[PDB]
């Protein structure tokens, strides 16, 4: 478990914040939010929790993500979690967090596969995290089931648009490997909000459920459908694994063996896996934080220039200074005589 | 393929399933959530009452270990008037292996 690529980026945020906080101003470290987009049963929830590094989300077959979950990571001296609707309560075990998520979902949506556009806000504190916003959205569908109205498609789409048309947001498009990539819904959305692929990152899931004799080699090599940032293959847990409480360590080891042994993927074994997706995202934050430094320097540079002309004199102040008093006297008298002539004569 | 490939293919479907004296076979794999099928959405829009539509489930040997399609084959998840029929075809390895029908 855990995400150790944050450690190299936490102090940079602290140092810059301490730099501005001393002057009574805050640092515009507007780190982007990460939205996970995909279709029903694509694997989005499994992907997202691997970036957080904690096992707390609900996952499995069926419509499990019935409400948008917004996770806010906050740097803190101790690790704990809390909800907005459980004010005054403290969560010290993520299993309780997962159960609360299901309970809060059913209380509003019912049990017959309902949805609700009102999100759930989870705030996890920890010393090993940045101040990040992570969004876990419901998957998209075509036809209603259970109590879903005829317009279930568009209600889900609007929930999606509110979080992906927002600037400064990484779109993490997850698609299954055992379905034709031309018929993925994630990529249809990405190419409508991010035409040039500057934000979009593709993930290919379910590489271990391919039909025998077929592979995704022309996908992971960015040949079938060119994507600016390429595709990353991942092998998450199976539904049996979820119900079997399979450990994370075993899942990662199996993912490593898979890519190292599959004949069509060995030459890409180092571009794929859970840890590589962490590295790409972390590197994506680091590029953003370092791309904003020029603005911060210019702000401080402008302020010094404005203040410098006066503090040059204040720093040399001595109360016993006849020269200052007489210089002040000549300035006041010259100001009065100019103001006086202005009002009477019209000069100036 | 131009940007409007989606609506060019759809306009071809709407020339054969938008008329009477026609049966429609809604084909969809079983290794994906049935709620996301494009076959049913088209059939439901053209044949709301399910008079003509018949559902087919094509890939039952490719389902993730630990689940099954009973909720569909028993016409419970998305009840369809004429039910659903499950089939198991030749894999890609078999097509290239010259396996007899
Ligand atoms: N074996 C395997 N199972 C997967 C993979 N990706 C997703 N699944 C399964 O697909 C189901 C759906 O997972 P989930 O992410 O909750 O779908 P979601 O509704 O999009 O969140 C789960 O049972 C996962 O175990 C994969 O790469 N390999
Ligand atoms: N293993 C397996 N493969 C299947 C099954 N049904 C279809 N396929 C595969 O589906 C692939 C494409 O089928 P096809 O009918 O051409 O899809 P189409 O583009 O709609 O015609 C073929 O390679 C088949 O081997 C199945 O039940 N099991
Ligand atoms: Mg989900």
Swiss-Prot record, chain A:
Segments of this protein annotated with the region G4 motif: 205-208
Region described as G3 motif: spans on this chain: 136-139
Outcome, altering residue 330 to R: Significantly decreases receptor-mediated endocytosis
Positions of the UniProt region annotated as G1 motif: 38-45
Known outcome of mutating residue 294 to A: Does not significantly affect receptor-mediated endocytosis
Assigned protein family: Belongs to the TRAFAC class dynamin-like GTPase superfamily. Dynamin/Fzo/YdjA family.
PTM-bearing positions, type 3'-nitrotyrosine: 125
A GO term for molecular function: GTPase activity
Subunit organization: Homodimer; homodimerization is mediated by the dynamin-type G domain which promotes assembly-stimulated GTPase activity. Homo-tetramer formed from two dimers in the absence of lipid. Oligomerizes into a helical polymer that self-assembles around the vesicle membrane, when associated to the menbrane through lipid binding.
Binding site for GDP: 41, 43-46, 59-60, 206, 208, 211, 236-237, 239
Domain of life: Eukaryota
Annotated region described as G5 motif, given as residue ranges: 235-238
Role this protein plays: Catalyzes the hydrolysis of GTP and utilizes this energy to mediate vesicle scission and participates in many forms of endocytosis, such as clathrin-mediated endocytosis or synaptic vesicle endocytosis as well as rapid endocytosis (RE). Associates to the membrane, through lipid binding, and self-assembles into rings and stacks of interconnected rings through oligomerization to form a helical polymer around the vesicle membrane leading to constriction of invaginated coated pits around their necks.
Protein name: Dynamin-1
Annotated GO CC locations: cell projection; chromaffin granule; clathrin-coated pit; cytoplasm; endocytic vesicle; extracellular exosome; microtubule; plasma membrane
Subcellular location: Cell membrane; Membrane, Clathrin-coated pit; Cytoplasmic vesicle; Presynapse
Record keyword GTP-binding present: yes
């Amino acid at each position: 478990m855990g995400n150790r690529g944050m450690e190299d980026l936490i102090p940079l945020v602290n140092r810059l914040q301490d730099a501005f906080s001393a002057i009574g101003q805050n640092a515009d470290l507007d780190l982007p939010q990460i939205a996970v987009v995909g279709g029903q049963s694509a694997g989005a929830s499994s992907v997202l929790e691997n970036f957080v590094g904690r096992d707390f989300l609900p996952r499995g077959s069926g419509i499990v993500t019935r409400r948008p979950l917004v996770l806010q990571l906050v740097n803190a001296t101790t690790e704990y979690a809390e909800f907005l609707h459980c004010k005054g309560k403290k969560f010290t075990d993520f299993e309780e967090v997962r159960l609360e998520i299901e309970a809060e979902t059913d209380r509003v949506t019912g049990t017959n596969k309902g949805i609700s556009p009102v999100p759930i806000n989870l705030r996890v504190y920890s010393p090993h995290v940045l101040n990040l916003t992570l969004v876990d959205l419901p998957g998209m569908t075509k036809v209603p089931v259970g109590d879903q109205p005829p317009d279930i498609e568009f209600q889900i789409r609007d929930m999606l648009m509110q979080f992906v048309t927002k600037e400064n947001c990484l779109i993490l498009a997850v698609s299954p490997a055992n379905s034709d990539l031309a018929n993925s819904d994630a990529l249809k959305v990405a190419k409508e909000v991010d035409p040039q692929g500057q934000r979009t990152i593709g993930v290919i899931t379910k590489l271990d459920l391919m039909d025998e004799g077929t592979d995704a080699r022309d996908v992971l090599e960015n040949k079938l459908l060119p994507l600016r940032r390429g595709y990353i293959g991942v092998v998450n847990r199976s539904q049996k694994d979820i119900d079997g409480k399979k450990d994370i360590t075993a899942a990662l080891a199996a993912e490593r063996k898979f890519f190292l042994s599959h004949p069509s993927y060995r030459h890409l074994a180092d571009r794929m896996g859970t840890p590589y997706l962490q590295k790409v995202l972390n590197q994506q934050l680091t590029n953003h934080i370092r791309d904003t430094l020029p603005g911060l320097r210019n702000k401080l540079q402008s302020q010094l220039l404005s203040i410098e002309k006066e503090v040059e004199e204040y720093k040399n102040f001595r109360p016993d200074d006849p020269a200052r008093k007489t210089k002040a006297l000549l300035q006041m008298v010259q100001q009065f005589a100019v103001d006086f002539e202005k009002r009477i004569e019209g000069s100036g």
